[PDB]
Amino acid sequence: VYWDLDIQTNAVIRERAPADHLPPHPEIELQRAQLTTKLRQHYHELCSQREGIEPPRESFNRWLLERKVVDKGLDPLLPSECDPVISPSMFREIMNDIPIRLSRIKYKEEARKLLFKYAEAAKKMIDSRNVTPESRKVVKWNVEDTMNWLRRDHSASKEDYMDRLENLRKQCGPHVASVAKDSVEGICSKIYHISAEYVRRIRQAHLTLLKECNISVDVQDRLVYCYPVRLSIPAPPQTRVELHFENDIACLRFKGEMVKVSRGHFNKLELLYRYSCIDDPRFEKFLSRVWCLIKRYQVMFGSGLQGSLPVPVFEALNKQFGVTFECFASPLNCYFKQFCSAFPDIDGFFGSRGPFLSFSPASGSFEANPPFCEELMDAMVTHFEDLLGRSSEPLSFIIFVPEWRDPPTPALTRMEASRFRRHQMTVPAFEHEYRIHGTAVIFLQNNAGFAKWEPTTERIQELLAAYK
Numbered sequence: 001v002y003w004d005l006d007i008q009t010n011a012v013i014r015e016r017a018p019a020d021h022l023p024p025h026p027e028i029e030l031q032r033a034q035l036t037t038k039l040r041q042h043y044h045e046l047c048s049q050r051e052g053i054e055p056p057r058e059s060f061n062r063w064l065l066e067r068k069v070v071d072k073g074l075d076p077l078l079p080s081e082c083d084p085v086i087s088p089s090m091f092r093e094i095m096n097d098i099p100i101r102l103s104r105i106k107y108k109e110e111a112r113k114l115l116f117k118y119a120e121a122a123k124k125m126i127d128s129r130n131v132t133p134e135s136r137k138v139v140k141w142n143v144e145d146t147m148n149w150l151r152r153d154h155s156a157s158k159e160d161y162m163d164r165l166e167n168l169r170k171q172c173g174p175h176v177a178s179v180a181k182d183s184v185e186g187i188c189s190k191i192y193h194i195s196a197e198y199v200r201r202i203r204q205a206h207l208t209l210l211k212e213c214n215i216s217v218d219v220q221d222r223l224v225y226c227y228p229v230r231l232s233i234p235a236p237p238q239t240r241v242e243l244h245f246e247n248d249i250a251c252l253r254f255k256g257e258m259v260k261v262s263r264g265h266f267n268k269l270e271l272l273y274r275y276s277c278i279d280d281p282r283f284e285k286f287l288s289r290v291w292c293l294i295k296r297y298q299v300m301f302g303s304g305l306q307g308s309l310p311v312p313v314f315e316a317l318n319k320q321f322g323v324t325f326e327c328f329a330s331p332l333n334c335y336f337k338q339f340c341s342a343f344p345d346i347d348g349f350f351g352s353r354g355p356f357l358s359f360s361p362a363s364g365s366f367e368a369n370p371p372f373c374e375e376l377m378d379a380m381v382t383h384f385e386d387l388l389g390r391s392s393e394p395l396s397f398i399i400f401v402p403e404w405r406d407p408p409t410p411a412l413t414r415m416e417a418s419r420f421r422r423h424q425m426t427v428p429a430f431e432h433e434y435r436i437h438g439t440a441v442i443f444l445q446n447n448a449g450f451a452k453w454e455p456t457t458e459r460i461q462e463l464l465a466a467y468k
C-alpha cells in the first residue's frame with residue numbers, strides 16, 4: 001500500500017494541443033542508454049586528465065537536471081541547445097573537489113592524512129601549472145607552513161587536524177580556484193558539446209525508424225481537468241519484449257538486454273497504464289513501453305539527488321489539504337495517478353502531465369518535493385508565483401525542501417519572502433523510503449486557495465501526526 005491511484009485530480013488546466021515528442025521505442029532507448037554511458041565515460045576521462053580527480057559524486061545527474069531548465073533541444077534526456085554553454089552546477093561541483101575531494105573522517109590518522117593529501121596536491125598544482133606570482137607565493141607559504149606544523153614532535157588531535165585543513169582550504173581555495181577555472185569551464189563545455197553530438201545521432205536514428213514504419217512526423221481558452229500528455233505522432237508498432245518473473249522481480253528482455261522492476265511496481269505500472277493510455281486497448285505496446293520506462297530511469301540515475309515522502313504523509317496531505325497531485329514525481333515513485341515528471345515522451349502513458357515548468361494549472365491543491373537541483377528549484381519558485389498571481393481560483397502548493405542554511409539556496413530564501421506564503425514549519429529530514437538538519441515545509445497559496453485549504457492549527461497538527 002504505497003500509493004492511492006483512486007484519488008481523482010483537482011488540477012484544472014487550459015486544454016493543450018498534443019505534444020510533438022517522438023514516440024518511444026526500445027531500439028532508440030537502447031541507443032540513448034549506450035551513448036549516455038559513453039558520455040559518463042568522457043566526463044570521467046576529462047576530470048581525470050584535466051584535474052586528476054574523479055567526477056564529483058552525483059554531479060553528472062545534477063548536470064542533467066540543471067541543463068534541462070534551459071535546454072531548447074530535441075532530446076528528452078540529454079542537453080543540446082543551452083544558454084549558457086557552461087553549466088554553473090557542474091562548474092561549482094568540480095571546483096569544490098579541487099585540488100582533491102574531501103572525504104569523510106572518523107579517525108585522527110585519517111584527518112592527518114587528508115590534510116597532508118590536500119597540502120601535497122596544492123603544491124603539485126602550483127609546481128606544474130600556470131599561476132600568477134601572487135597566488136604562487138600565497139599557496140607555497142601555506143603549504144610550507146602546514147608541512148612545518150606536521151613536522152613537529154608532539155602530535156595534535158583529530159579535531160585540530162580537521163581545523164587545520166579547514167583553515168588551509170580557506171586560504172588556498174581562491175588561489176587554487178583561479179588556477180583551475182578555465183580548465184574546469186572547458187570540461188563543462190566539452191561534455192555539453194559531446195552531448196549535443198549524441199543527441200543529433202539519436203534524433204536521426206529515431207527519425208529513420210519512424211520513416212521505416214511509414215509514420216509521418218509532420219483549445220487555449222477551455223479549462224479542463226488535467227490529463228496525461230498525449231503525443232501527436234502515431235506510435236510505432238510494438239517490438240518483441242519478453243516478460244518473466246523471478247522471485248517477485250519482473251524481468252523484461254529486449255534483444256538480449258534485460259531490465260528489472262519489482263512485481264509490485266510492475267502491477268502499479270499496469271494500473272497507471274490502464275488509467276492513462278488511450279492508444280493501446282489490447283496492451284500490445286505495454287511491454288515495449290515498460291521496457292523503455294525502466295531503461296530511461298536506469299540511465300537517468302546511472303545504475304543522493306532526491307527524497308521521498310512516507311505514505312501517511314500523503315494521506316494527510318490529501319485528507320487535510322485536498323492535495324491530489326505531485327509536481328515532481330515519476331511513474332515509479334508517484335503516490336497519485338496524476339503528477340508531473342521529467343520525461344513526457346514515455347511517462348505520459350503512465351499518467352505524467354509532463355515537466356513541471358511546462359505545467360500551468362489554474363486551480364488545484366498540489367504537493368512539491370523537487371530533486372536537489374538549485375537551478376530547477378529557483379525556476380520552480382518563479383513558476384509558483386507566476387501561477388498563483390495569474391489565477392483567482394483556489395490554488396495551493398505545499399513544498400518540501402531541505403532545510404539548508406550554509407548558505408540557504410536562493411529558492412528557499414525566495415519562498416520564505418513570497419507574498420503567497422501562508423505557513424512554514426520543519427519536519428524530519430528526508431530518509432530512505434523502502435518502497436541533514438530537517439525538511440522545510442512551505443505553504444504557498446493565493447487568496448482563494450488560502451480560504452479553501454487554510455493551514456489551521458488542527459490541520460497542521462494532523463499533518464505533523466503523520467510522522468509520529
Ligand SMILES: Nc1ncnc2c1ncn2[C@@H]1O[C@H](CSCC[C@H](N)C(=O)O)[C@@H](O)[C@H]1O
Pocket residue numbers: 065306307308309326327328329330333334335340341342354355356357367368369370371
Ligand atoms: N522537470 C521536472 N518536472 C517534474 N518532475 C521532475 C522534473 N525533473 C525531475 N523530476 C522528478 O522529480 C522527482 C523528485 S523525487 C519526488 C518523489 C515523490 N513523488 C514525492 O513527491 O515525495 C523525481 O522522480 C524526478 O525524476
